[PDB]
Design a protein around this ligand. Structure first.
Ligand SMILES: C=C1/C(=C\C=C2/CCC[C@]3(C)[C@@H]([C@H](C)CC#C[C@@H](O)[C@]45C[C@H]6C[C@H](C[C@H](C6)C4)C5)CC[C@@H]23)C[C@@H](O)C[C@@H]1O
Lengths: 237, 10
């Protein structure tokens, strides 16, 4: 049974998400323009930088997250940012043509755009697999936002100090998600849905590793690093 | 040392 507190948590996360994800994509006009070697890196760096900011905003509204210290908050966002972007991006992702469609042609991103930002199939293939696997869970929006929150608040991120506290915050979110699934997700789509959602978080850790290794490479080239944003540099190092 | 991230968290 969903306690009143569990329902409150869900309502908070739904609203935190509505406040930080603008499904009109109007802000995308302000980025450096997409150009179609690393022709998409300026635009995609702007896109990611913008979304890091939204993710930080979302994190701040996660019940329990502001009980954390600044350090722990920073550490969780530093390690989770790229993962949460991948997760949240599932909302624009379309299987019709395995692209992220943000309202117009200019802001329709496919695998070729992703390679024009310096990535290879090392990232691109598990990323598309991930988006398609996520899309196939047909998550309720309640499940989607709970999974983003669970992703951010993980006690095993590198740098975490008060792991017991991060773990208690994450437990309350997991128990809420497990309970939501049981009470509100009909079979057959509920079938081991929890375990499947957790598998997607394991897939994100893997994508994060790929991200880091490629980012480390791209960094040792100051001419490319110069095209990033100050936020991206601070968050990804 | 994370001034911008720190600032977005405040
Ligand atoms: C970002 C989102 C959206 C789409 C996400 C996409 C489509 C475009 C390409 C993205 C941003 C992918 C990204 C290029 C993968 C990556 C990465 C980092 O290593 C990278 C690569 C470049 C250099 C830096 C800065 C950025 C450009 C990001 C590190 C993953 C999610 C993809 C649109 C909407 O749903 C909002 C959501 O937050």
């Amino acid at each position: 049974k969903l306690s009143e507190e569990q329902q409150h948590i869900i309502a908070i996360l739904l609203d935190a998400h509505h406040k930080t994800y603008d499904p009109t994509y109007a802000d995308f006009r302000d980025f450096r323009p997409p150009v179609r070697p690393l022709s998409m890196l300026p635009h995609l760096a702007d896109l990611v930088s913008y979304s890091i900011q939204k993710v930080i905003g979302f994190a701040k509204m996660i019940p329990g997250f502001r009980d954390l210290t600044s350090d722990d908050q920073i550490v969780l966002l530093k390690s989770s940012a790229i993962e949460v972007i991948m997760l949240r991006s599932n909302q624009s992702f379309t299987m019709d043509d395995m692209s992220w469609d943000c309202g117009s042609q200019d802001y329709k991103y496919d695998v070729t755009d992703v390679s024009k930002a310096g990535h290879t199939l090392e990232l691109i293939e598990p990323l598309i697999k991930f988006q398609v696997g996520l899309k196939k869970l047909n998550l309720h929006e309640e499940e989607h936002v709970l999974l983003m929150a669970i992703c951010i608040v993980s006690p095993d991120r590198p740098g975490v100090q008060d792991a017991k506290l991060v773990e208690a915050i994450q437990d309350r979110l997991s128990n809420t998600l497990q309970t939501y699934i049981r009470c509100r997700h009909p079979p057959p789509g509920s079938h081991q849905l929890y375990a499947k959602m957790i598998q997607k978080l394991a897939d994100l850790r893997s994508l994060n590793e790929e991200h880091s290794k490629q980012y480390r490479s791209l960094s040792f080239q100051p001419e490319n690093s110069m095209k990033l944003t100050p936020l991206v540099l601070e968050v990804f190092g | 040392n994370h001034p911008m991230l720190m600032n977005l968290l405040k």
